[PDB]
Amino acid sequence: MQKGNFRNQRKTVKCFNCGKEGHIAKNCRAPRKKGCWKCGKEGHQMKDCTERQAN
RNA sequence: GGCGACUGGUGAGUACGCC
Ligand SMILES: [Zn+2]
Ligand SMILES: [Zn+2]
């Protein structure tokens, strides 16, 4: 919860974007330009996802 | 450490790159 929690990076962090460890989304090494990391469709984003809990 | 880039869908910045 605390910001200091991120200090876990000292022993590998948890990227809440890619999921990988060692780094954080804040600075993910994902060589991506722009894509929906919610569905997995490049060109758009989650905020612009087509399957966003919409019936 | 600094910077750059970025995204903020991003912990706030340094995992990357370099020295
Ligand atoms: Zn990542
Ligand atoms: Zn989508």
What is the distance, to the nearest Å, from the Cα of residue A54 to the centroid of all Cα atoms in its chain? 22
Task: Determine the nucleotide nearest to A26 by Cα–C1' distance.
Answer: B10
Q: Given CA atoms A14, A20, A25, A28 in this order, what sign does their dihedral have?
A: positive
Non-local CB neighbours of A15 within 8 Å, separated by 6+ positions: A21, A22, A23, A24, A25, A28
| Strand B: protein residues, Cβ closer than 7 A | A 3, 6, 9, 13-17, 22-29, 32, 35-38, 44-47
User: Whose atoms come closest to the Cα of A42: which ligand?
Assistant: 2
Assign a CATH topology to domain A1-55.
HIV-1 Nucleocapsid Protein (4.10.60)
CA geometry: angle A30, A26, A37, nearest 5 deg: 50
Query: What is the amino acid identity at position A49?
Result: C
The residue extents of the domains of chain A are: 1-55
Non-local CB neighbours of A30 within 8 Å, separated by 6+ positions: A17, A18
N-terminal to C-terminal alpha carbon distance within chain A: 34
Place of tokens 């809990």: A53
